């Protein structure tokens, strides 16, 4: 359900995707700013390294939620989480509507949150939520 854990996950992911799309700082809207900055830097690295591959992936008739659930079907780790968020941020900006400021941050962030918490809620809590991402600080 949509409990505290759900919002701890969702609020981090959705604020990052908003920042990526709008180029406005969103760290002050999350509780864990240190881990947000780690997430942001790690996604930036993934995108810089792999955007051409992402471009080929997105040129096809894709459902992003199938992609997300495929990554997490059998196991989770922080590199996987970072790569999902990075890909999905990159995707969101590419699929933004021309005639509205709709970049689908709601459905995309909720899908990522649900894919994490449907099978890995105890793992996430045991990581102390986003604290476990700090192993990727620089």
């Amino acid at each position: 359900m949509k409990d505290e854990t759900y919002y701890i996950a969702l609020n981090m992911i959705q604020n990052y995707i908003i920042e990526y799309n709008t180029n406005k700082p969103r760290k002050s809207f999350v509780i864990d700013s240190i881990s947000y900055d780690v997430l942001k830097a790690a996604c930036k690295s993934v995108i810089k390294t792999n955007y051409n591959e992402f471009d080929i992936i997105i040129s096809r008739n894709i459902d992003f939620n199938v992609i997300v659930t495929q990554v997490l079907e059998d196991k989770i780790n922080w590199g996987r989480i970072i790569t999902i968020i990075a890909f999905c941020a990159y995707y969101s900006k590419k699929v933004k509507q021309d005639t509205s400021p709709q970049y689908y941050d709601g459905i995309i962030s909720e899908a990522i949150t649900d894919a994490i918490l449907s099978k890995y809620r105890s793992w996430f809590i045991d990581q102390d939520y986003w604290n476990g991402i700090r192993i990727y600080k620089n």
Partner: peptide, 22 residues
């Protein structure tokens, strides 16, 4: 890449490599 390699499979490899690199 072969169309038999699922897209999530490709992103999982990126993520597991990211762990190694960092």
């Amino acid at each position: 890449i072969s169309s038999a390699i699922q897209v999530g499979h490709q992103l999982a490899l990126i993520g597991d490599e990211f762990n190694r690199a960092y």
